[PDB]
Coordinates of C-alpha atoms and ligand atoms in Angstrom, one line a residue:
Chain A
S6 CA 0.0 0.0 0.0
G7 CA 1.0 3.7 -0.5
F8 CA 1.5 5.4 -3.8
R9 CA 4.6 7.6 -4.5
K10 CA 5.8 9.7 -7.4
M11 CA 8.4 7.0 -8.2
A12 CA 11.3 7.2 -10.8
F13 CA 12.9 4.2 -12.5
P14 CA 16.1 3.0 -10.8
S15 CA 18.8 5.2 -12.5
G16 CA 21.8 2.9 -12.3
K17 CA 21.6 1.8 -16.0
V18 CA 21.6 5.6 -17.1
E19 CA 24.2 6.6 -14.5
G20 CA 26.6 4.3 -16.4
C21 CA 26.0 6.3 -19.6
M22 CA 26.6 9.9 -18.3
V23 CA 29.8 11.8 -19.4
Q24 CA 31.0 15.4 -19.4
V25 CA 31.3 17.2 -22.8
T26 CA 33.3 20.5 -23.0
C27 CA 33.6 22.6 -26.1
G28 CA 35.8 25.7 -25.4
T29 CA 34.3 27.2 -22.2
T30 CA 30.9 25.4 -22.4
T31 CA 30.5 22.2 -20.2
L32 CA 27.4 20.1 -20.2
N33 CA 26.4 16.4 -20.1
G34 CA 26.5 13.8 -22.8
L35 CA 25.0 10.3 -23.1
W36 CA 27.5 7.6 -24.0
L37 CA 25.9 4.6 -25.8
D38 CA 28.1 2.2 -27.7
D39 CA 30.8 4.4 -29.3
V40 CA 28.7 7.5 -29.7
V41 CA 28.3 10.4 -27.2
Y42 CA 25.0 12.4 -27.7
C43 CA 24.8 16.0 -26.3
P44 CA 23.0 19.2 -27.1
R45 CA 24.6 21.0 -30.1
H46 CA 24.6 24.3 -28.1
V47 CA 27.7 22.9 -26.4
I48 CA 29.5 24.8 -29.3
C49 CA 27.9 28.1 -28.3
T50 CA 29.1 31.0 -26.1
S51 CA 26.1 32.5 -24.3
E52 CA 26.7 35.4 -26.8
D53 CA 26.2 32.8 -29.7
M54 CA 22.9 31.7 -28.0
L55 CA 21.2 35.0 -28.9
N56 CA 21.1 34.0 -32.6
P57 CA 23.4 31.0 -33.3
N58 CA 24.1 29.6 -36.9
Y59 CA 25.0 26.0 -35.8
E60 CA 26.3 24.9 -39.2
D61 CA 28.6 27.9 -39.3
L62 CA 29.7 27.6 -35.7
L63 CA 30.4 23.9 -36.3
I64 CA 32.8 24.6 -39.2
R65 CA 35.2 26.1 -36.5
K66 CA 35.1 22.8 -34.5
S67 CA 37.3 19.7 -34.9
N68 CA 37.1 16.3 -33.2
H69 CA 39.8 17.4 -30.7
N70 CA 37.8 20.5 -29.7
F71 CA 35.1 18.2 -28.1
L72 CA 36.5 17.2 -24.6
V73 CA 34.7 14.0 -23.4
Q74 CA 35.4 12.7 -19.9
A75 CA 33.8 9.5 -18.5
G76 CA 34.4 9.4 -14.8
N77 CA 37.9 11.0 -14.6
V78 CA 39.1 9.3 -17.9
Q79 CA 39.2 11.2 -21.3
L80 CA 37.6 9.6 -24.4
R81 CA 39.2 10.0 -27.8
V82 CA 36.7 11.7 -30.2
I83 CA 37.2 10.2 -33.8
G84 CA 34.2 11.8 -35.4
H85 CA 31.3 14.3 -34.9
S86 CA 28.1 15.1 -36.7
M87 CA 25.0 17.3 -36.1
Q88 CA 21.6 15.6 -36.2
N89 CA 18.9 18.2 -35.7
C90 CA 19.7 19.8 -32.3
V91 CA 22.1 17.1 -31.0
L92 CA 25.7 16.4 -31.7
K93 CA 26.8 12.8 -32.0
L94 CA 30.5 12.4 -31.0
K95 CA 32.0 9.1 -32.3
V96 CA 34.6 8.0 -29.6
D97 CA 37.2 5.2 -30.0
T98 CA 35.7 3.1 -27.1
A99 CA 32.3 1.5 -26.8
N100 CA 30.7 2.3 -23.4
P101 CA 31.2 -1.0 -21.5
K102 CA 28.1 -0.2 -19.4
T103 CA 25.8 0.4 -22.4
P104 CA 22.4 -1.0 -21.5
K105 CA 20.0 -2.4 -24.0
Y106 CA 18.4 0.8 -25.3
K107 CA 16.0 2.4 -27.7
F108 CA 15.3 6.0 -28.7
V109 CA 11.6 6.9 -28.5
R110 CA 9.7 10.1 -29.2
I111 CA 7.0 10.2 -26.5
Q112 CA 3.5 11.8 -26.8
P113 CA 2.2 14.6 -24.4
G114 CA 0.9 13.0 -21.2
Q115 CA 3.6 10.4 -21.1
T116 CA 5.8 10.2 -18.0
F117 CA 9.5 9.5 -17.7
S118 CA 12.3 9.7 -15.2
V119 CA 15.0 12.4 -15.4
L120 CA 18.5 11.8 -14.1
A121 CA 19.7 15.4 -13.4
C122 CA 23.5 15.6 -14.0
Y123 CA 26.2 18.3 -13.7
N124 CA 29.7 17.8 -15.2
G125 CA 28.7 14.2 -16.3
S126 CA 27.8 13.3 -12.7
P127 CA 24.4 12.3 -11.3
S128 CA 22.8 14.7 -8.7
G129 CA 19.3 13.2 -8.5
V130 CA 16.4 11.4 -10.1
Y131 CA 12.7 12.5 -10.4
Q132 CA 9.6 11.7 -12.4
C133 CA 8.3 14.2 -15.1
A134 CA 5.5 14.2 -17.7
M135 CA 5.6 15.7 -21.2
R136 CA 3.1 18.5 -20.7
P137 CA 0.4 19.0 -23.4
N138 CA 2.2 22.2 -24.4
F139 CA 5.4 20.1 -24.9
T140 CA 7.3 21.6 -21.9
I141 CA 8.3 19.7 -18.8
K142 CA 8.4 21.0 -15.3
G143 CA 11.9 19.8 -14.3
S144 CA 14.6 20.8 -11.8
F145 CA 17.5 21.9 -14.0
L146 CA 20.3 24.4 -13.0
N147 CA 23.1 25.8 -15.3
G148 CA 25.2 22.8 -16.4
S149 CA 22.2 20.3 -16.4
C150 CA 21.9 20.4 -20.3
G151 CA 22.3 16.9 -21.8
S152 CA 20.6 15.3 -18.7
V153 CA 18.2 12.7 -20.2
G154 CA 14.7 11.4 -19.6
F155 CA 14.0 7.7 -19.9
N156 CA 11.6 4.8 -19.2
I157 CA 12.8 1.2 -18.4
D158 CA 11.0 -2.0 -19.7
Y159 CA 12.8 -4.8 -17.7
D160 CA 16.4 -4.5 -19.1
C161 CA 15.8 -2.0 -22.0
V162 CA 16.2 1.8 -21.4
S163 CA 14.0 3.9 -23.7
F164 CA 15.6 7.3 -23.9
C165 CA 12.8 9.9 -24.7
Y166 CA 14.3 13.3 -23.6
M167 CA 17.5 15.3 -23.5
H168 CA 17.5 18.6 -21.6
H169 CA 18.4 21.8 -23.6
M170 CA 16.5 24.8 -22.4
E171 CA 14.7 26.8 -19.7
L172 CA 11.9 29.2 -20.9
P173 CA 11.8 32.6 -19.1
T174 CA 8.8 31.2 -17.1
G175 CA 11.2 28.6 -15.6
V176 CA 9.6 25.5 -17.5
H177 CA 11.9 23.3 -19.5
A178 CA 12.3 22.3 -23.2
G179 CA 14.3 19.6 -24.9
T180 CA 14.6 17.1 -27.7
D181 CA 14.2 13.4 -28.2
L182 CA 17.6 11.6 -28.8
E183 CA 17.3 12.3 -32.6
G184 CA 17.7 16.0 -31.6
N185 CA 14.1 17.0 -32.5
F186 CA 12.6 19.5 -29.9
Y187 CA 9.3 18.5 -28.3
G188 CA 6.9 21.3 -29.3
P189 CA 7.9 24.5 -31.2
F190 CA 11.0 25.4 -29.2
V191 CA 14.4 26.2 -30.7
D192 CA 17.9 26.2 -29.1
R193 CA 18.2 30.0 -29.2
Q194 CA 18.1 32.6 -26.4
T195 CA 14.9 34.3 -27.7
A196 CA 11.4 35.0 -26.3
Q197 CA 9.7 31.6 -26.4
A198 CA 6.4 31.3 -24.6
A199 CA 4.6 28.0 -23.7
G200 CA 1.0 27.4 -24.7
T201 CA -1.8 26.4 -22.2
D202 CA -0.5 23.8 -19.7
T203 CA -3.7 21.7 -19.7
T204 CA -4.3 18.8 -17.2
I205 CA -3.7 15.2 -18.5
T206 CA -7.2 13.9 -17.8
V207 CA -6.4 10.2 -18.4
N208 CA -3.5 10.5 -15.9
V209 CA -5.8 12.1 -13.2
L210 CA -8.3 9.2 -13.7
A211 CA -5.4 6.6 -13.4
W212 CA -4.3 8.3 -10.2
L213 CA -8.0 8.3 -8.8
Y214 CA -8.0 4.5 -9.5
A215 CA -4.6 4.4 -7.7
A216 CA -6.2 6.2 -4.7
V217 CA -9.2 3.8 -4.6
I218 CA -6.7 0.8 -4.7
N219 CA -4.8 2.3 -1.8
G220 CA -7.9 3.0 0.4
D221 CA -8.6 6.7 -0.4
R222 CA -12.3 6.5 -1.5
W223 CA -14.1 9.6 0.0
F224 CA -14.5 11.3 -3.5
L225 CA -16.3 8.3 -5.1
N226 CA -19.8 9.7 -5.9
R227 CA -23.2 8.1 -6.8
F228 CA -23.1 9.6 -10.4
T229 CA -22.0 8.6 -13.9
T230 CA -21.6 10.7 -17.1
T231 CA -20.9 10.3 -20.8
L232 CA -17.6 11.2 -22.6
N233 CA -19.4 14.2 -24.2
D234 CA -20.8 15.5 -20.9
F235 CA -17.5 14.9 -19.1
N236 CA -15.6 16.7 -21.9
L237 CA -17.8 19.8 -21.8
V238 CA -16.8 20.2 -18.1
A239 CA -13.1 19.1 -18.8
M240 CA -12.7 21.9 -21.4
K241 CA -14.1 24.5 -18.9
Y242 CA -11.3 23.4 -16.4
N243 CA -8.4 23.2 -19.0
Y244 CA -8.4 19.4 -18.9
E245 CA -7.5 17.5 -22.1
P246 CA -10.4 15.9 -23.9
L247 CA -11.0 12.2 -22.9
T248 CA -11.2 9.8 -25.9
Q249 CA -12.4 6.2 -26.1
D250 CA -8.7 5.3 -26.5
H251 CA -8.2 6.7 -22.9
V252 CA -11.3 4.7 -21.7
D253 CA -9.8 1.6 -23.3
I254 CA -6.4 2.2 -21.6
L255 CA -8.1 2.6 -18.2
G256 CA -9.9 -0.7 -18.7
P257 CA -7.6 -2.8 -16.5
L258 CA -7.8 -0.3 -13.6
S259 CA -11.7 -0.3 -14.1
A260 CA -11.6 -4.1 -14.0
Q261 CA -9.4 -4.3 -10.8
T262 CA -11.6 -1.8 -8.8
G263 CA -15.0 -2.6 -10.4
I264 CA -15.5 1.2 -11.0
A265 CA -16.6 1.9 -14.6
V266 CA -14.4 4.5 -16.3
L267 CA -17.4 6.9 -16.8
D268 CA -18.3 6.5 -13.1
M269 CA -14.8 7.7 -12.2
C270 CA -15.2 10.5 -14.8
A271 CA -18.4 11.6 -12.9
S272 CA -16.3 11.6 -9.6
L273 CA -13.6 13.7 -11.3
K274 CA -16.4 16.0 -12.7
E275 CA -17.7 16.6 -9.1
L276 CA -14.1 17.2 -7.8
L277 CA -13.5 19.8 -10.5
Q278 CA -16.9 21.5 -9.7
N279 CA -16.8 21.2 -5.9
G280 CA -13.0 21.3 -5.2
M281 CA -11.4 19.2 -2.5
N282 CA -13.0 21.2 0.4
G283 CA -9.6 21.0 2.2
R284 CA -9.4 17.2 1.8
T285 CA -6.5 15.3 0.3
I286 CA -6.2 12.3 -2.1
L287 CA -3.0 10.2 -1.8
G288 CA -1.6 13.1 0.3
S289 CA -2.2 15.7 -2.5
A290 CA -4.5 18.7 -2.3
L291 CA -4.7 18.9 -6.1
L292 CA -5.5 16.3 -8.8
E293 CA -2.2 14.6 -9.8
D294 CA -1.7 14.1 -13.6
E295 CA 1.9 12.8 -13.8
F296 CA 1.0 9.1 -13.4
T297 CA 0.0 7.3 -16.6
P298 CA -2.4 4.3 -16.4
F299 CA 0.7 2.1 -17.2
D300 CA 2.5 3.8 -14.2
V301 CA -0.4 3.1 -11.8
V302 CA -0.5 -0.6 -12.9
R303 CA 3.3 -0.9 -12.7
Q304 CA 3.6 0.6 -9.2
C305 CA 0.4 -1.2 -8.0
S306 CA 1.8 -4.6 -9.2
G307 CA 5.6 -4.1 -8.3
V308 CA 7.1 -4.7 -11.8
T309 CA 11.0 -4.9 -11.8
Chain B
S9 CA 15.0 26.6 -11.9
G10 CA 12.2 24.3 -10.9
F11 CA 12.1 22.2 -7.6
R12 CA 11.3 18.5 -7.7
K13 CA 10.9 15.8 -5.1
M14 CA 14.2 14.3 -6.1
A15 CA 15.8 11.0 -5.0
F16 CA 19.5 10.1 -4.9
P17 CA 20.7 8.3 -8.0
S18 CA 20.1 4.6 -7.1
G19 CA 22.8 2.8 -9.0
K20 CA 25.2 2.4 -6.0
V21 CA 22.3 0.7 -4.0
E22 CA 21.0 -1.3 -7.0
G23 CA 24.4 -3.1 -7.0
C24 CA 23.7 -4.3 -3.4
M25 CA 20.2 -5.7 -3.7
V26 CA 19.8 -9.5 -3.5
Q27 CA 16.9 -12.0 -3.0
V28 CA 16.7 -13.9 0.3
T29 CA 14.4 -17.0 0.6
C30 CA 13.8 -18.9 3.9
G31 CA 11.3 -21.8 3.3
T32 CA 8.4 -20.1 1.4
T33 CA 9.2 -16.5 2.5
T34 CA 11.0 -14.4 -0.2
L35 CA 12.1 -10.8 0.4
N36 CA 15.1 -8.5 -0.3
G37 CA 18.5 -8.3 1.3
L38 CA 21.4 -5.8 1.2
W39 CA 24.7 -7.3 0.3
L40 CA 27.7 -5.2 1.6
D41 CA 31.1 -6.8 1.7
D42 CA 30.5 -10.5 2.6
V43 CA 27.3 -9.8 4.7
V44 CA 23.7 -9.9 3.5
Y45 CA 21.3 -7.9 5.8
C46 CA 17.6 -8.7 5.7
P47 CA 14.6 -8.5 8.0
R48 CA 14.6 -11.4 10.5
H49 CA 10.9 -12.1 9.7
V50 CA 12.3 -13.9 6.5
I51 CA 12.2 -17.0 8.9
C52 CA 8.4 -16.6 9.6
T53 CA 5.3 -18.1 8.0
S54 CA 2.5 -15.5 8.1
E55 CA 1.1 -17.8 10.8
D56 CA 4.4 -17.2 12.8
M57 CA 3.9 -13.4 12.3
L58 CA 0.9 -13.4 14.7
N59 CA 3.2 -14.0 17.7
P60 CA 6.8 -15.0 16.6
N61 CA 9.6 -16.2 19.0
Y62 CA 12.5 -15.3 16.7
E63 CA 15.2 -17.0 18.8
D64 CA 13.1 -20.2 18.9
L65 CA 12.3 -20.0 15.1
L66 CA 16.0 -19.4 14.3
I67 CA 17.1 -22.7 16.2
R68 CA 15.3 -24.6 13.3
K69 CA 17.4 -22.7 10.6
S70 CA 20.8 -23.5 9.2
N71 CA 23.1 -21.6 6.8
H72 CA 21.8 -23.8 3.9
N73 CA 18.1 -22.8 4.7
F74 CA 18.9 -19.1 3.7
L75 CA 18.8 -19.0 -0.1
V76 CA 20.6 -15.9 -1.3
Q77 CA 20.5 -15.0 -5.0
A78 CA 22.4 -12.0 -6.5
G79 CA 21.2 -11.5 -10.1
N80 CA 20.6 -15.1 -11.1
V81 CA 23.7 -16.5 -9.2
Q82 CA 23.4 -18.2 -5.8
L83 CA 25.6 -17.0 -2.9
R84 CA 27.0 -19.6 -0.4
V85 CA 25.9 -18.7 3.2
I86 CA 28.7 -19.6 5.6
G87 CA 27.2 -17.9 8.7
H88 CA 24.1 -16.3 10.1
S89 CA 23.3 -14.2 13.2
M90 CA 20.3 -12.2 14.5
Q91 CA 21.1 -8.5 15.5
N92 CA 17.9 -6.9 16.9
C93 CA 15.3 -7.3 14.0
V94 CA 17.8 -8.0 11.2
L95 CA 19.6 -11.2 10.1
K96 CA 23.2 -10.9 9.0
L97 CA 24.0 -13.7 6.5
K98 CA 27.8 -14.2 6.1
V99 CA 28.4 -15.2 2.4
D100 CA 31.7 -16.6 1.0
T101 CA 31.9 -13.7 -1.6
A102 CA 32.4 -9.9 -1.0
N103 CA 30.0 -7.9 -3.1
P104 CA 32.3 -6.6 -5.8
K105 CA 29.9 -3.6 -6.3
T106 CA 30.0 -2.7 -2.5
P107 CA 30.1 1.2 -2.4
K108 CA 31.7 3.2 0.4
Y109 CA 29.0 3.0 3.0
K110 CA 27.9 3.8 6.6
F111 CA 24.9 2.8 8.7
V112 CA 23.2 5.8 10.3
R113 CA 20.1 6.0 12.5
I114 CA 18.3 9.2 11.3
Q115 CA 16.1 11.5 13.4
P116 CA 12.4 12.3 12.6
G117 CA 12.2 15.0 9.9
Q118 CA 15.2 13.6 8.0
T119 CA 14.6 12.6 4.4
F120 CA 16.1 9.7 2.4
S121 CA 15.6 7.8 -0.9
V122 CA 13.9 4.4 -0.9
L123 CA 14.8 1.8 -3.6
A124 CA 11.6 -0.3 -3.7
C125 CA 12.7 -3.9 -4.6
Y126 CA 10.9 -7.2 -5.3
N127 CA 12.8 -10.6 -5.5
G128 CA 16.1 -8.6 -5.1
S129 CA 15.3 -6.5 -8.2
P130 CA 14.7 -2.7 -8.3
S131 CA 11.2 -1.5 -9.2
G132 CA 11.6 2.2 -8.5
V133 CA 13.1 5.0 -6.4
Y134 CA 11.3 7.8 -4.4
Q135 CA 12.0 10.3 -1.6
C136 CA 10.6 9.7 2.0
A137 CA 10.9 11.4 5.3
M138 CA 11.0 9.8 8.8
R139 CA 7.7 11.1 10.1
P140 CA 7.7 12.6 13.7
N141 CA 5.7 9.5 14.7
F142 CA 8.6 7.3 13.3
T143 CA 6.5 5.9 10.4
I144 CA 7.2 6.6 6.8
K145 CA 4.7 7.0 4.0
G146 CA 6.2 4.6 1.4
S147 CA 5.0 2.6 -1.6
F148 CA 5.6 -1.0 -0.5
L149 CA 3.7 -4.2 -1.8
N150 CA 4.1 -7.7 -0.5
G151 CA 7.7 -8.8 -1.3
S152 CA 9.1 -5.3 -0.7
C153 CA 10.5 -6.1 2.9
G154 CA 14.3 -5.6 3.0
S155 CA 14.1 -2.6 0.5
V156 CA 16.4 0.1 2.0
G157 CA 16.4 3.9 2.5
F158 CA 19.6 5.8 2.0
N159 CA 21.4 9.2 1.6
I160 CA 24.5 9.7 -0.6
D161 CA 27.3 12.1 0.3
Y162 CA 29.5 12.2 -2.9
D163 CA 30.6 8.5 -3.1
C164 CA 29.4 7.3 0.4
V165 CA 26.0 5.6 0.8
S166 CA 24.6 6.1 4.3
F167 CA 21.9 3.4 4.8
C168 CA 19.3 4.6 7.3
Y169 CA 16.2 2.4 6.8
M170 CA 15.2 -1.2 6.0
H171 CA 11.5 -1.9 5.2
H172 CA 9.8 -4.4 7.5
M173 CA 6.1 -3.6 8.1
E174 CA 2.9 -2.0 6.9
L175 CA 0.5 -0.8 9.8
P176 CA -3.2 -1.5 9.2
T177 CA -3.5 2.3 8.3
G178 CA -1.2 1.6 5.3
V179 CA 1.8 3.6 6.7
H180 CA 5.2 1.9 7.0
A181 CA 7.6 0.9 9.7
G182 CA 11.2 -0.4 9.7
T183 CA 14.6 -0.5 11.2
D184 CA 18.0 1.1 10.8
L185 CA 20.7 -1.4 9.5
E186 CA 21.4 -2.5 13.1
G187 CA 17.9 -3.9 13.1
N188 CA 16.5 -1.3 15.7
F189 CA 12.9 -0.2 14.7
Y190 CA 12.3 3.5 14.3
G191 CA 9.7 4.2 16.9
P192 CA 7.8 1.7 19.1
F193 CA 7.0 -0.8 16.3
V194 CA 7.7 -4.6 16.6
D195 CA 8.0 -7.2 13.8
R196 CA 4.7 -8.9 14.8
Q197 CA 1.3 -9.0 13.1
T198 CA -0.5 -7.3 16.0
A199 CA -2.5 -4.0 16.3
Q200 CA 0.1 -1.2 16.2
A201 CA -1.3 2.3 15.8
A202 CA 0.9 5.3 14.8
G203 CA 0.9 8.5 17.0
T204 CA 0.1 12.0 15.6
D205 CA 1.7 12.6 12.2
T206 CA 2.8 16.2 12.8
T207 CA 4.2 18.5 10.1
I208 CA 8.0 18.9 10.0
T209 CA 8.0 22.7 10.4
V210 CA 11.8 23.3 9.6
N211 CA 11.2 21.3 6.3
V212 CA 8.2 23.5 5.3
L213 CA 10.3 26.6 5.9
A214 CA 13.1 25.2 3.8
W215 CA 10.6 24.4 1.0
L216 CA 9.2 28.0 1.3
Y217 CA 12.8 29.3 0.9
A218 CA 13.1 26.9 -2.2
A219 CA 9.9 28.5 -3.6
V220 CA 11.2 32.0 -3.2
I221 CA 14.5 30.9 -4.9
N222 CA 12.5 29.4 -7.8
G223 CA 10.3 32.6 -8.3
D224 CA 7.1 31.6 -6.2
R225 CA 6.8 34.6 -3.9
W226 CA 3.0 35.5 -3.6
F227 CA 2.9 34.2 0.1
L228 CA 5.7 36.5 1.4
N229 CA 3.9 38.8 3.8
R230 CA 4.8 42.1 5.6
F231 CA 5.0 40.5 9.1
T232 CA 7.5 38.9 11.4
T233 CA 7.0 36.8 14.6
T234 CA 9.0 35.3 17.5
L235 CA 9.7 31.6 18.0
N236 CA 7.3 31.5 21.0
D237 CA 4.5 33.3 19.0
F238 CA 5.1 31.1 15.9
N239 CA 5.1 27.9 18.1
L240 CA 1.8 28.7 19.8
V241 CA 0.2 28.7 16.2
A242 CA 2.4 25.7 15.1
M243 CA 1.1 23.6 18.0
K244 CA -2.6 24.5 17.1
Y245 CA -1.9 23.2 13.5
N246 CA 0.0 20.0 14.6
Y247 CA 3.3 21.4 13.4
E248 CA 6.5 20.4 15.3
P249 CA 7.9 23.1 17.6
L250 CA 10.6 25.3 15.9
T251 CA 13.8 25.6 17.9
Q252 CA 16.8 27.9 17.6
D253 CA 18.7 24.9 16.2
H254 CA 16.2 24.9 13.3
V255 CA 16.7 28.7 12.8
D256 CA 20.5 28.1 12.8
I257 CA 20.1 25.3 10.1
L258 CA 17.9 27.7 7.9
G259 CA 20.6 30.4 8.2
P260 CA 22.2 29.8 4.7
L261 CA 18.7 29.8 3.0
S262 CA 18.0 33.1 4.9
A263 CA 21.3 34.5 3.7
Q264 CA 20.7 33.5 0.1
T265 CA 17.2 35.0 -0.1
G266 CA 17.7 37.9 2.4
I267 CA 14.5 36.7 4.2
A268 CA 15.0 36.5 8.0
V269 CA 14.0 33.1 9.3
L270 CA 11.3 34.7 11.6
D271 CA 9.9 36.7 8.7
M272 CA 9.4 33.3 6.8
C273 CA 7.8 31.9 10.0
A274 CA 5.3 34.8 9.9
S275 CA 4.5 34.0 6.2
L276 CA 4.0 30.3 7.2
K277 CA 1.8 31.5 10.2
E278 CA -0.4 33.4 7.8
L279 CA -0.6 30.4 5.3
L280 CA -1.7 28.1 8.2
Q281 CA -4.3 30.7 9.4
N282 CA -5.6 31.8 5.9
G283 CA -4.9 28.7 3.8
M284 CA -3.7 28.8 0.2
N285 CA -7.1 30.2 -1.1
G286 CA -6.8 27.8 -4.1
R287 CA -3.2 29.0 -4.9
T288 CA -0.2 26.7 -5.3
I289 CA 3.5 26.9 -4.1
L290 CA 6.0 25.0 -6.3
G291 CA 3.0 23.2 -7.8
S292 CA 1.6 22.0 -4.4
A293 CA -1.7 23.0 -2.9
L294 CA -0.4 22.0 0.6
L295 CA 2.8 22.9 2.5
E296 CA 5.5 20.3 1.7
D297 CA 7.5 19.0 4.6
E298 CA 9.7 16.2 3.0
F299 CA 12.5 18.6 2.0
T300 CA 15.2 19.2 4.6
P301 CA 17.1 22.5 4.6
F302 CA 20.1 20.4 3.4
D303 CA 17.9 19.0 0.6
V304 CA 16.9 22.5 -0.6
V305 CA 20.6 23.7 -0.6
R306 CA 21.7 20.5 -2.4
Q307 CA 19.0 20.6 -5.2
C308 CA 19.4 24.5 -5.5
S309 CA 23.2 24.2 -5.9
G310 CA 23.4 20.9 -8.1
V311 CA 25.6 18.8 -5.8
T312 CA 26.8 15.4 -7.4
Ligands
LIG404 C1 23.8 23.9 -20.2 C2 24.0 22.9 -19.3 C3 24.9 24.8 -20.5 N1 26.0 24.7 -19.6 C4 26.3 25.7 -18.7 O1 25.6 26.7 -18.6 C5 27.5 25.5 -17.8 N2 27.2 26.0 -16.5 C6 27.6 25.4 -15.4 C7 27.3 26.1 -14.1 O2 28.2 24.3 -15.4 C8 28.8 26.2 -18.4 C9 30.0 25.9 -17.6 O3 29.0 25.9 -19.8
LIG405 C1 7.9 -9.0 2.9 C2 8.4 -8.6 1.8 C3 7.5 -10.4 3.1 N1 7.5 -11.2 1.8 C4 6.4 -11.5 1.2 O1 5.3 -11.3 1.7 C5 6.5 -12.3 -0.1 N2 5.4 -11.8 -1.0 C6 5.6 -11.6 -2.3 C7 4.4 -11.2 -3.1 O2 6.7 -11.7 -2.9 C8 6.4 -13.8 0.0 C9 6.7 -14.6 -1.2 O3 7.2 -14.2 1.1

């Protein structure tokens, strides 16, 4: 019993973190096989960041200008290329701790663990969600760039995020491991504003299921609703529309608790309309939306 | 910027987790050097748990009755002893991944990371606090016993907790690594009720400092208070008394923000008395008390 904002064990990713220095810029890289992946803004001065031409800045850079340090041992860079907003540095040594891995581009609402790193060294691990506006609400100081987000399926690390940017509002933007930004963001020090940070409705419902499973039941009501009726109220509260696909995904949690998905929608509708009245659910005074249905099943079943 | 409930990177502890089986009971052990530490209730049937005599149950157990598996390789048990509520199993192989480590007994209000494990395998990592009633609010399913709590100082893992028990209220109890329970709890399936779960005042103040550092400032008021005046209001709201020792500990956060500790106490006093009025602080609708002053400094400075 109990339900915690839980990250994946980080060891498999700790074994991939290196330091990348180009001139006076230091950030983190991800060493998988004989490639080190890092944000391409490693080549920029903060002056360059105001309006960088990355192809032009890269002409001035050779293999030997990219200083890669794994623990306190230097890796020899034998190649470099730009792919979208990441640099791939070919090194002469395969990472011996390379886990089974994939690169995935996640959808908004999907959750992942972040291993916050400085100078190629792990500082901490926390759980994030890709917001519907393609930001994440992270904890990232200067030097944290190249920190990665990941999911683990048994022995396979799926890398879904690399940290690049803080917006002036202090929310975070980054790329998949192909170097494509999530959302419309660019690796330039210019005015970039996030869109509406809507609530991930299917995640709130999963977490309400998690609450019922863990004995928190006060909010269960005598009502049901329809997707269309629910969605009219959802829109009013800046909640994402609920689709039949989301209902299908919540099926196993419905089965386990015996609470029809649309019944739990009607409970959520009343919580939105009435508020919490000073009550808590799983120790939160607001509706949590950074647990996926898959996260709730995983934590509630003890997957390793 | 941003402030997250962040755990220590877990890799160093992942390398210590093993499976311990005695008869039909399986749980987790911690392998450090040539010793495996696990809850002594590994020797119990759930029938035994109603009123176990551990010394008598242990007479029936030999080295070869303790099945220790590290990854999918069996360790040879060459010795066993009971220390308080833990068993120490001497194995013929030093754990090659043994980190620098210490055993510490933490105080209430102190935070630590938990690596939740099943069958000696890591499922996830999350941040906890030792509650003032010496429970923790964990996420622990059957099989999670022997999961450990820890802090890391650079390269040294300080192990402070081993999971033993869920109270009927679904809160958690356990021991330090000497096998001494935190609080009055016993490893027996009997009515054990937790005392008052008070709020860790010094931790709330640290987190209010964290909020100011990260741009959340709406709750800063025009008032100050005294420790005695603050404490009269604290007691009314089931907050722990604030001592001069806590004021001293918050000194660096005071210095960094220029907000006198007693000024921040007066802000907290108004938040207790007025509530949040539907507002949030660092994305919480309640006052967070599972960040220590040391945690806020660490996360705000990016220690590795
Ligand atoms: C992103 C991580 C860019 N890197 C930095 O800003 C570095 N800052 C610190 C404090 O490490 C800088 C040395 O390049
Ligand atoms: C504490 C972890 C005691 N262990 C258990 O209850 C085990 N349960 C599961 C599901 O692993 C049992 C096999 O001994």
